[PDB]
C-alpha cells in the first residue's frame, strides 16, 4: 500500500541512500540483517511502503542502487546494512563516467538504463499500490546527475501519473567539488523542471554551516551530513507511513506547495537541531520547532529566503503536540514575516502532524519550502554556466560523447526561464 | 422509532465522531464493546443479544484514521464494514475528492448508508461531520450530499462544519475548497451548523484554563454540542425539538442556511464550584459575543433565528424569563421580519461528563443555534481570500489537471458572491 | 438584596482587603475554605454547595502581592477569576498605571465588575481599596472610577484611601500621584473615608502598647473600620445606616467629600480589663485630637459632619447624652450653617476580635466618620510639595514620556486650589 | 515576566558579572549545573527575570559574555558556575583592543558588536515581557568601556522603550590601574550621558575603603569587591523579583531618581557590611541600616555626599521588617541632614521594602543617591582629560584607529555641561 521505490544513483546518491534505509530501519526497527527486532506495532503496520517482506519474515528494501563505478558498489555492500539490499539490485558498470553528464546519459548511461528499467519494471509490477518514485544524487556530478536524469525521463514516461520526487545535492556557491559543475548541474535541472514533481534542493556548503554552528561538530564527516539529509528524507514519508492527527502523503504535499508545473524546487529542513553540549539547556516545544525551521540558517539549501518571498511552505510535524499550538505558530510565523511571503496565496502554510517522533527524541519536524529564493541559485549556476560556454571550456568532451551545442543552448534557456518565472513570482 | 444517521468524512469528521461516540456510549450506558451491563435506538441497533451496533458511518480517503478507529479502545463498537476506507486522500484537493479519488468509494458508502436506512424504520436525517478545508471533507462531502439528495430526495441533511479561522490555518488550499464545498452542498444542503478551531482555542483558554489544547478538547466540546442537539431523541423532555424542526426555525430562505453553534456552562470543576449557573447566567453566557465557537463578533450582523436547546434542571418559566431579558437587551439585536426569533427545546437529562474531560459536572446546559447575518463577514473574508489566489492563479494546475475546470472556479466564486448578495439583502430593514 | 462590591487596587488596598475579608470571615462565620461548620448576601454569594464566594475584586498591576493572595490560607475563597493581575505594575507613576499599563486591564476588571454586578439582585455601590501615593493605586484607581461612573452612573462609590502622612512618606513621587488622582476621582467619587499610616502608628503606639507595629495591625484597624462602616447592611440594629445614608449626612458640597476615619475602642487587653469603657467614654475618645487616623488635628478647623456609627451593647439614650456632652464642649466647634452635624447608626453586633490580633474583646464600638476643615491643612502640604517638585520640574519626565502631559499637570494643580478655595470658603462663618 | 538581559564587557564587567551570577543562583537556589536545590517556590516564582529554563529543568542565565580577549572567557567557563552560562553566549575576539575606546568602539568592536547583536536579538525575541537590560563594565578599560558603549547605543536605537542600567567601575581618584584611563573614561561617559538610564558608579577605592575599614580585611582581593557590588545588583533586582510589602521594579526606580533626563548617576550602597569580629555586637535593625547606608564611608563611589545635596535616593530594604519603622528612620535622616537634601524635592526617598533576605542575614537593605556630589568625579575626570589633550598625549593612537579631535572635544563638552547641570541643581 502506497509503495515507494527508491533509486539511488552515482557516489552522492548512493552514500545518502545508504544512510537513508539505515535511519529507515531504525525508525521500524529492521535488523541489518532483515528482521524485524522491533517494539511497537505500528512499525510493521505500514512496513511495505519501503519494504518487500522476503520468505523469513525477513524485509528486504524496495531499493535500487545503481552507479557507473562498482566501488560504491563494493562499499555499501560490506558495510553494516550491507547485507539488507537484495542482492539483484545492485546494477553497475565498469567505466565511471568520470564527471561527464553525456557519458552518463548518453554512451553507458544507455546499456545501465535498460538493465536498472528492467529491475524498475520489476519492483514496481510487484508492487500493490504504487504511491511513486524518490531519487537520489548529485546534478554537480557524472553518473549521478546524468543518469539519475535518464532514469528519471524513462520512468516518468512510462509511469507519468506516479509521484516522482527527488533529493538532488547542488552545487555549492563558494567551493565546487567538481571542474565541470556548471555543465552537469544546468542539463540536469533542464531535465529535472520537466520531468519531476518535487525536486529538493541540498547543498553541502549550508549542511556544513549547520554542523559547525548548530550541532557544533568539529569533524563533520559525510556521515552526518548525510544523517540530516537522511532525516529530512525519513520526516517526509514518516508523514505518509506511521498514523497522525492530521496525515499527508507525497501527493498532498505536491498539491500544497507546486502552485504551477515549473516551481517544485524546495529548500529542506530540519527543527530539532541542538548540540550535545546545548541539549540540556533547550526546551523542545512547538514554537522552538517553528522558530528554528524558519530560521534562514537551518534551511539546507545555501538561498537566503529573506531575499525572496515564500510561495507556500510544509511543516511536517512528529511527535504528540497540541494542533492548537501548531496553528498559533503557523500563524504568527504569517504574520510576523508577512514581507516574505507572497500575497495572492493566504494561508503559505501545509501543516502535516504524525503521531510517531524519531528516535530519540520526543517532538520533531522537517520543513519543506517553495520559495522564491532558489532563482539566487539557478542564477549562479547560470553564470557559471554561461562563463564557462562563452569561451568554450571543457566542451569537447560533452560534444565528443555525442551531444550538441544546441543542446547547451536549450538547457540555459530553460533554467533562465525557470528563473524568470520565479522573479516573476 | 425516529432514527438518525450520522456520517463522518474526513480526518476532523472521524475524530469529531470518536469524541461523538463516546460521548453517546458514556450517555446510554453502552461499554466500549458494545454490551450494557428505547433511548438507545435514535444512534444505536440492537442485533439479538446485549450488542449495540451505532447508526454511522466512518468513511475516509486515507486508511490512517479510520484504522486508528478500528483498533482503538472502541475496536469492536462499529461495525467493521460501515468504517469505509479508500488507500489514498485526497491531499487537500477537492478535484480529488470528489472527482477523481471520491468516485471509486461513493458507490461503497452509499451501499452502506442504504443497509443502514433499510435497517431502520423512521429516518429522521442524516448528520454529516466533515470540515470545510479539507480534501475528502469537501469534495467526497459535496458528491455524498448530492448523491444522498438525489437517493433520499426529502430526508432532512444536517451537517456540522468546521469552518476555516479567520486567522489560524492549516491548510494553504482552504479557500478553494470552501467555496467549492459551499457551491456544491448549498445546491444540496438543509442546514449547516458551523464551528471554528480558533473561536474554539479562545474558549478553551478564557473559561476552560486550559493553555494548551489538542484537537481532542475541541472534539469533545464539538460533541458535547452534538449531544445537547440530538438529546430530544434520544431523551425525554418537557419541548421536543426534532431535525426538521431545527430546519424549519433556523432557515428563513433557502440559501441562508449557516447557523452557529454555541454551548454556554463551558467552565473547568473550581469555576463551576465557585459559580451558580442557572438558566438566565448560561442563556446570557451563550448571547455574549466572546461565547461564540464561530469567530464571528454577533454585533456586527442581526440575529434571524435563534435555537435555545436547554438540557437538565430546568424550569420553563426561568427560560421564558432569561429570553424577555435577551429580548429587552439593546446590544442584541435581530432583524425586522422575525419578531419571533426564539426555538425553545428543553430536555430533561443534563450533560454527561466525560471521564477525562475538562468540563465540570453541571445541572444544566443550553446550546444555543444562531442564524445570523454576521456570518457574511466572515463570507466576505473567505471570497477575498479565494479572489486573491485565483487571480493569481495559484494552486489552480492541482485542480485541472483532476477532473476540473476553471468554469467551475469561476461559478463557484459567482455563486458566492450571490450569497453575499442575499446575506445583504436579509440584513437590510423592511421599508 | 442589598449586595456591594468591594475593589481592591494595589498592595495597599489588596493587604487590607485581605485583613477585611479575614475579618468578614470570622465575623459570619465562613471558613477560610468558603464553606461553613441572610447577612453573609451583601458580601457573599452563596453557590448550590455551603461555598461563600466574597463580592469583591483584587485587581493589581503586579502579580505579587495578588500571587501570595492566591497561595495563602484564603487560596480557596476567593473566585479564581476575580484575582485580576498584570506582568508589569506602574512604578509609582500615575501615567503608568492611568494611560500605558492600565488601559490593557481595565476592560478584564470592568467585565469581572460587571459579571459581580449581573449576579447582584440589587447593588448599593462599591467600595474602592487604594493608596493615594501608588502608581496603580491612583492612575488605575481613577481610570476605574470613571469607567464605573460612565457605566453605573447612579450606584455608590466609595473610597477607602490611605492619605499621604505629613512626615513618613515611602515615597518620593507621591505628591505627583496624590494631586492628580484627586483631580481625576474628585471628578467622579461620592465620598472619600481617608487615614494615614502615620496615624494609625501613633495610635498603635500610644493604645495597644504595640512599639513595632507592621502594616498588618494598621490593615487590621481599617478592616475594624470597614466592619463598623458595613455593619448596617450585614446585621440588624436599632438605628440602620445604608452607603446612601453616609453619602447624603457626610457630603454637603460635591468637592468636599473626604471625611476622616475614626475607631474609639482601641485598646490592648489589660488595659481593656481595667476599664469601663462605656458610650460616653467611647465617644469622647473619638472626638479626642490625639485619636483621629489621619493626622490632621480637628482644633484647627471646624466639623461639618460627623457619622457616629455605635455596635454592640449601646444604648440610644446613652448616645444621645453622649451626643449632647459632645455638643456643648467648647474645644469641638462646628460650622455655623450645619446646626445638626450628627448622623448616627446603632448596630446589634459587638466587633468580632481577630484571632492573633492586638484588639481586645470589647462590648461596644463606635467609628467616627467626620468631615471637617482640618483636611484643608492636610491638602495645603500636599500642593505645597506638588509645587517645589513641579517647579523644579522633577520626575516629569517619567510621567510625560509615558502618556501624559505637562498641562495635566498644571491643570491638576489648579484643580487642587479650586478645593483649597472651596474649603476656605466653607469654612468661613456666614454674615 | 519582566526578564532582564545581562551583558558583561571587559575584563572587569566579566569578572563583576561571574561574581554576580554566583550571588544570585544562591539567591535563586541554582546548582552550579544548572538545577534548583532550594528550598522555597519564591526562588521558582520569578525565575524568570533572570534564568531561562532549559529542557531538563536546568536553569541557563540570560547572560551574554563578551569580550575582546579569550583569557577572560577561559577564566570564567573553568570556574566554578562556569558550566551555567551557555556555551553560544560567549562572544569573544583575539585582539583584545588594548586599554583603547577606540579600537573597542570603532574597529574589533564593530565585528564583535554585530555578532554580540545578533545573540542579544535572540535573547530578547526569547523573552516574554522584556524589563530591560543591565550592562556590567569599566569606563577606564579598553573592550569594557569602548564595547560596552557601542553595544548600549546599539540596542538603545533598537529597544527605546526598555530600561537600561549599567554598574559601571568609574576611574579612582588616587591611584589609576590604566595610563589613558582619562581618555576613555570621557568617551564612555559622554556616551553613557544620552544612551542609559540608571548608570551605577563604583570606585575600587571606595571598595578598598570599605572593605579595609568597614569590614576589616586584611588582603582584600577582587573577589570581595565584586561580592560587593554583586550585593548591590541583587538588591535591587531583588525588589524587582520577590514579593515584598513595597514592590518596586527598575522603571519604579529610574521614575524616583532622574528628576532630569541626563542626571542619572548613582551612588550605590549596601547597609550591613560588619567585620567577622564585631557581628555580635552589633544589633541588626532598620536604624542601624539606614544610619549605614547614609554614611558616607559606605556609598561605594569616591564621592563625598556632604560636598554636594541628594538630589533623591532610594532605599531598598530586604527582610521582614515594620513600614513604620522604616518610614520614621527616612523622615528622620532627612530632618537631620536637611542641609544635604535638596529644597524643591519634599520627600527626596524614594522605599522599597521586599520579603525574602539575602543569603546569611535577616535584614539587609541597598542604597542608591542621584546627588550632585558625582559632579567631584567629572570634575576630576575633566581635568585629567584635559591635562592630557591640552598637550596631545597618547591621543595618536585614538586618532589612527579612525578617531578625531572633534570627538574629544565633543565629549569633554558633553561631560562639562554635565557638571555644569549637577552644579546648577
Same mark, same amino acid.
Request: proline share 5%; hydrophobic share 35%.
Given at each position: 500500500?502506497?509503495?515507494?521505490?527508491?533509486?539511488?544513483?552515482?557516489?552522492?546518491?548512493?552514500?545518502?541512500?545508504?544512510?537513508?534505509?539505515?535511519?529507515?530501519?531504525?525508525?521500524?526497527?529492521?535488523?541489518?540483517?532483515?528482521?524485524?527486532?522491533?517494539?511497537?506495532?505500528?512499525?510493521?503496520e505500514?512496513?511495505?511502503?519501503?519494504?518487500?517482506?522476503?520468505?523469513?519474515?525477513?524485509?528486504?528494501?524496495?531499493?535500487?542502487?545503481?552507479?557507473?563505478?562498482?566501488?560504491?558498489?563494493?562499499?555499501?555492500?560490506?558495510?553494516?546494512?550491507?547485507?539488507?539490499?537484495?542482492?539483484?539490485?545492485?546494477?553497475?558498470?565498469?567505466?565511471?563516467?568520470?564527471?561527464?553528464?553525456?557519458?552518463?546519459?548518453?554512451t553507458?548511461?544507455?546499456?545501465?538504463?535498460?538493465?536498472?528499467?528492467?529491475?524498475?519494471?520489476?519492483?514496481?509490477e510487484?508492487?500493490?499500490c504504487?504511491?511513486?518514485?524518490?531519487?537520489?544524487?548529485? =546534478?554537480?556530478?557524472? #553518473?549521478? %546527475? $546524468?543518469?539519475? @536524469?535518464? +532514469?528519471?525521463?524513462?520512468?516518468?514516461?512510462?509511469?507519468?501519473? &506516479?509521484?516522482?520526487?527527488?533529493?538532488?545535492?547542488?552545487?555549492?556557491?563558494?567551493?565546487?567539488?567538481?571542474?565541470?559543475?556548471?555543465?552537469?548541474?544546468?542539463?540536469?535541472?533542464?531535465?529535472?523542471?520537466?520531468?519531476?514533481?518535487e525536486?529538493?534542493?541540498?547543498?553541502?556548503?549550508?549542511?556544513?554551516?549547520?554542523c559547525?554552528?548548530?550541532?557544533?561538530?568539529?569533524?563533520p564527516?559525510?556521515?552526518?551530513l548525510?544523517h =540530516?539529509?537522511?532525516? #529530512?528524507? %525519513? $520526516?517526509?514519508? @514518516?508523514? +505518509?507511513?506511521?498514523?497522525?492527527?492530521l496525515?499527508?502523503?507525497? &501527493?498532498?504535499?505536491a498539491?500544497?506547495?507546486?502552485?504551477?508545473?515549473?516551481?517544485?524546487?524546495f529548500?529542506?529542513?530540519?527543527?530539532?537541531?541542538?548540540?550535545?553540549?546545548?541539549?540540556?539547556?533547550?526546551?523542545?516545544?512547538?514554537?522552538?520547532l517553528?522558530?528554528?525551521m524558519?530560521?534562514?540558517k537551518?534551511?539546507?539549501?545555501?538561498?537566503?529566503?529573506?531575499?525572496?518571498?515564500?510561495?507556500?511552505?510544509a511543516?511536517?510535524?512528529?511527535?504528540?503536540?497540541?494542533?492548537?499550538?501548531?496553528?498559533?505558530?503557523?500563524?504568527?510565523?504569517?504574520?510576523?514575516?508577512?514581507?516574505?511571503?507572497?500575497?495572492?496565496?493566504?494561508?503559505?502554510?501545509?501543516?502535516?502532524?504524525?503521531?510517531?517522533?524519531?528516535?530519540?527524541?520526543?517532538?520533531?519536524?522537517?520543513?519543506?519550502?517553495?520559495?522564491?529564493?532558489?532563482?539566487?541559485?539557478?542564477?549562479?549556476?547560470?553564470?557559471?554556466?554561461?562563463?564557462?560556454?562563452?569561451?568554450?571550456?571543457?566542451?569537447?568532451?560533452?560534444?565528443?560523447?555525442?551531444?550538441?551545442?544546441?543542446?547547451?543552448?536549450?538547457?540555459?534557456?530553460?533554467?533562465?526561464?525557470?528563473?524568470?518565472?520565479?522573479?516573476?513570482? | 422509532?425516529?432514527?438518525?444517521?450520522?456520517?463522518?468524512?474526513?480526518?476532523?469528521?472521524?475524530?469529531?465522531?470518536?469524541?461523538?461516540?463516546?460521548?453517546?456510549?458514556?450517555?446510554?450506558?453502552?461499554?466500549?464493546?458494545?454490551?450494557?451491563?428505547?433511548?438507545?435506538?435514535?444512534?444505536?441497533?440492537?442485533?439479538?443479544?446485549?450488542?449495540?451496533?451505532?447508526?454511522?458511518?466512518?468513511?475516509?480517503?486515507?486508511?490512517?484514521?479510520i484504522?486508528?478507529?478500528?483498533?482503538?479502545?472502541?475496536?469492536?463498537l462499529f461495525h467493521?464494514?460501515?468504517?469505509?476506507?479508500?488507500?489514498?486522500?485526497?491531499?487537500?484537493?477537492?478535484?480529488?475528492?470528489?472527482?477523481?479519488?471520491?468516485?471509486?468509494?461513493?458507490?461503497?458508502?452509499?451501499?452502506?448508508?442504504?443497509?443502514?436506512?433499510?435497517?431502520?424504520?423512521?429516518?429522521?436525517g442524516?448528520?454529516?461531520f466533515?470540515?470545510?478545508?479539507?480534501?475528502?471533507?469537501?469534495?467526497?462531502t459535496?458528491?455524498?450530499?448530492?448523491?444522498?439528495?438525489?437517493?433520499?430526495?426529502?430526508?432532512?441533511?444536517?451537517?456540522?462544519?468546521?469552518?476555516?479561522?479567520?486567522?489560524?490555518?492549516?491548510?494553504?488550499?482552504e479557500?478553494?475548497?470552501?467555496?467549492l464545498?459551499?457551491?456544491?452542498?448549498?445546491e444540496?444542503?438543509?442546514?449547516?451548523?458551523?464551528?471554528?478551531?480558533?473561536?474554539?482555542?479562545?474558549?478553551?483558554?478564557?473559561?476552560?484554563?486550559?493553555?494548551?489544547?489538542?484537537?481532542?478538547?475541541?472534539?469533545?466540546?464539538?460533541?458535547?454540542?452534538?449531544?445537547?442537539?440530538?438529546?430530544?431523541?434520544?431523551?425525554?423532555?418537557?419541548?421536543?425539538?426534532?431535525?426538521?424542526?431545527?430546519?424549519?426555525?433556523?432557515?428563513?430562505?433557502?440559501?441562508?442556511?449557516?447557523?452557529?453553534?454555541?454551548?454556554?456552562?463551558?467552565?473547568?470543576?473550581?469555576?463551576?464550584?465557585?459559580?451558580?449557573?442557572?438558566?438566565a447566567?448560561?442563556?446570557?453566557?451563550?448571547?455574549?459575543?466572546?461565547?461564540?465557537?464561530?469567530?464571528?463578533?454577533?454585533?456586527?450582523?442581526?440575529?434571524?433565528?435563534?435555537?435555545?436547546?436547554?438540557?437538565?434542571?430546568?424550569?420553563?418559566?426561568?427560560?421564558?424569563?432569561?429570553?424577555?431579558?435577551?429580548?429587552?437587551?439593546?446590544?442584541?439585536?435581530?432583524?425586522?421580519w422575525?419578531?419571533?426569533?426564539?426555538?425553545?427545546?428543553?430536555?430533561?437529562?443534563?450533560?454527561?461528563?466525560?471521564?477525562?474531560?475538562?468540563?465540570?459536572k453541571?445541572?444544566?446546559?443550553?446550546?444555543?443555534?444562531?442564524?445570523?447575518?454576521a456570518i457574511?463577514?466572515?463570507?466576505?473574508?473567505?471570497?477575498?481570500?479565494?479572489?486573491?489566489?485565483?487571480?493569481?492563479?495559484?494552486?489552480?494546475?492541482?485542480?485541472?489537471?483532476?477532473?476540473?475546470?476553471?468554469?467551475?472556479?469561476?461559478?463557484?466564486?459567482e455563486?458566492?458572491?450571490?450569497?453575499?448578495?442575499?446575506?445583504?439583502?436579509?440584513?437590510?430593514?423592511?421599508?
Amino acid at each position: 500500500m502506497r509503495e515507494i521505490v527508491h533509486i539511488q544513483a552515482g557516489q552522492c546518491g548512493n552514500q545518502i541512500g545508504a544512510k537513508f534505509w539505515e535511519v529507515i530501519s531504525d525508525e521500524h526497527g529492521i535488523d541489518p540483517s532483515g528482521n524485524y527486532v522491533g517494539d511497537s506495532d505500528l512499525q510493521l503496520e505500514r512496513i511495505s511502503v519501503y519494504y518487500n517482506e522476503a520468505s523469513s519474515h525477513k524485509y528486504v528494501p524496495r531499493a535500487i542502487l545503481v552507479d557507473l563505478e562498482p566501488g560504491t558498489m563494493d562499499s555499501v555492500r560490506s558495510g553494516a546494512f550491507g547485507h539488507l539490499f537484495r542482492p539483484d539490485n545492485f546494477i553497475f558498470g565498469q567505466s565511471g563516467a568520470g564527471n561527464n553528464w553525456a557519458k552518463g546519459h548518453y554512451t553507458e548511461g544507455a546499456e545501465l538504463v535498460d538493465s536498472v528499467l528492467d529491475v524498475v519494471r520489476k519492483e514496481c509490477e510487484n508492487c500493490d499500490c504504487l504511491q511513486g518514485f524518490q531519487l537520489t544524487h548529485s =546534478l554537480g556530478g557524472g #553518473t549521478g %546527475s $546524468g543518469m539519475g @536524469t535518464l +532514469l528519471i525521463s524513462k520512468v516518468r514516461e512510462e509511469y507519468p501519473d &506516479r509521484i516522482m520526487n527527488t533529493f538532488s545535492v547542488v552545487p555549492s556557491p563558494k567551493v565546487s567539488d567538481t571542474v565541470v559543475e556548471p555543465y552537469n548541474a544546468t542539463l540536469s535541472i533542464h531535465q529535472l523542471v520537466e520531468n519531476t514533481d518535487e525536486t529538493y534542493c541540498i547543498d553541502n556548503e549550508a549542511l556544513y554551516d549547520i554542523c559547525f554552528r548548530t550541532l557544533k561538530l568539529a569533524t563533520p564527516t559525510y556521515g552526518d551530513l548525510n544523517h =540530516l539529509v537522511s532525516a #529530512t528524507m %525519513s $520526516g517526509v514519508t @514518516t508523514s +505518509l507511513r506511521f498514523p497522525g492527527q492530521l496525515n499527508a502523503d507525497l &501527493r498532498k504535499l505536491a498539491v500544497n506547495m507546486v502552485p504551477f508545473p515549473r516551481l517544485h524546487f524546495f529548500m529542506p529542513g530540519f527543527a530539532p537541531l541542538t548540540a550535545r553540549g546545548s541539549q540540556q539547556y533547550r526546551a523542545l516545544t512547538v514554537p522552538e520547532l517553528t522558530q528554528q525551521m524558519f530560521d534562514a540558517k537551518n534551511m539546507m539549501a545555501a538561498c537566503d529566503p529573506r531575499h525572496g518571498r515564500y510561495l507556500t511552505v510544509a511543516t511536517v510535524f512528529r511527535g504528540r503536540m497540541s494542533m492548537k499550538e501548531v496553528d498559533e505558530q503557523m500563524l504568527a510565523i504569517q504574520s510576523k514575516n508577512s514581507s516574505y511571503f507572497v500575497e495572492w496565496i493566504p494561508n503559505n502554510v501545509k501543516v502535516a502532524v504524525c503521531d510517531i517522533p524519531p528516535r530519540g527524541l520526543k517532538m520533531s519536524s522537517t520543513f519543506i519550502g517553495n520559495s522564491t529564493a532558489i532563482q539566487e541559485l539557478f542564477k549562479r549556476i547560470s553564470e557559471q554556466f554561461t562563463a564557462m560556454f562563452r569561451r568554450k571550456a571543457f566542451l569537447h568532451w560533452y560534444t565528443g560523447e555525442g551531444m550538441d551545442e544546441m543542446e547547451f543552448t536549450e538547457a540555459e534557456s530553460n533554467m533562465n526561464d525557470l528563473v524568470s518565472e520565479y522573479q516573476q513570482y | 422509532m425516529r432514527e438518525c444517521i450520522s456520517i463522518h468524512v474526513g480526518q476532523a469528521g472521524v475524530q469529531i465522531g470518536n469524541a461523538c461516540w463516546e460521548l453517546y456510549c458514556l450517555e446510554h450506558g453502552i461499554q466500549p464493546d458494545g454490551q450494557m451491563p428505547d433511548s438507545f435506538n435514535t444512534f444505536f441497533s440492537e442485533t439479538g443479544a446485549g450488542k449495540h451496533v451505532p447508526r454511522a458511518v466512518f468513511v475516509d480517503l486515507e486508511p490512517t484514521v479510520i484504522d486508528e478507529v478500528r483498533t482503538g479502545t472502541y475496536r469492536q463498537l462499529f461495525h467493521p464494514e460501515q468504517l469505509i476506507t479508500g488507500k489514498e486522500d485526497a491531499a487537500n484537493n477537492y478535484a480529488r475528492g470528489h472527482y477523481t479519488i471520491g468516485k471509486e468509494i461513493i458507490d461503497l458508502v452509499l451501499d452502506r448508508i442504504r443497509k443502514l436506512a433499510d435497517q431502520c424504520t423512521g429516518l429522521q436525517g442524516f448528520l454529516v461531520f466533515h470540515s470545510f478545508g479539507g480534501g475528502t471533507g469537501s469534495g467526497f462531502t459535496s458528491l455524498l450530499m448530492e448523491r444522498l439528495s438525489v437517493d433520499y430526495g426529502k430526508k432532512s441533511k444536517l451537517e456540522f462544519s468546521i469552518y476555516p479561522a479567520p486567522q489560524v490555518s492549516t491548510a494553504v488550499v482552504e479557500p478553494y475548497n470552501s467555496i467549492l464545498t459551499t457551491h456544491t452542498t448549498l445546491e444540496h444542503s438543509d442546514c449547516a451548523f458551523m464551528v471554528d478551531n480558533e473561536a474554539i482555542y479562545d474558549i478553551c483558554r478564557r473559561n476552560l484554563d486550559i493553555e494548551r489544547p489538542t484537537y481532542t478538547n475541541l472534539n469533545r466540546l464539538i460533541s458535547q454540542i452534538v449531544s445537547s442537539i440530538t438529546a430530544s431523541l434520544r431523551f425525554d423532555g418537557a419541548l421536543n425539538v426534532d431535525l426538521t424542526d431545527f430546519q424549519t426555525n433556523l432557515v428563513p430562505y433557502p440559501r441562508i442556511h449557516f447557523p452557529l453553534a454555541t454551548y454556554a456552562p463551558v467552565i473547568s470543576a473550581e469555576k463551576a464550584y465557585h459559580e451558580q449557573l442557572s438558566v438566565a447566567e448560561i442563556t446570557n453566557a451563550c448571547f455574549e459575543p466572546a461565547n461564540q465557537m464561530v469567530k464571528c463578533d454577533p454585533r456586527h450582523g442581526k440575529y434571524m433565528a435563534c435555537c435555545l436547546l436547554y438540557r437538565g434542571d430546568v424550569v420553563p418559566k426561568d427560560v421564558n424569563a432569561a429570553i424577555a431579558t435577551i429580548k429587552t437587551k439593546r446590544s442584541i439585536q435581530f432583524v425586522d421580519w422575525c419578531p419571533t426569533g426564539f426555538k425553545v427545546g428543553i430536555n430533561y437529562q443534563p450533560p454527561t461528563v466525560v471521564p477525562g474531560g475538562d468540563l465540570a459536572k453541571v445541572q444544566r446546559a443550553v446550546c444555543m443555534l444562531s442564524n445570523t447575518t454576521a456570518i457574511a463577514e466572515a463570507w466576505a473574508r473567505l471570497d477575498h481570500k479565494f479572489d486573491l489566489m485565483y487571480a493569481k492563479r495559484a494552486f489552480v494546475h492541482w485542480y485541472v489537471g483532476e477532473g476540473m475546470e476553471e468554469g467551475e472556479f469561476s461559478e463557484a466564486r459567482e455563486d458566492m458572491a450571490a450569497l453575499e448578495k442575499d446575506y445583504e439583502e436579509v440584513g437590510v430593514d423592511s421599508v
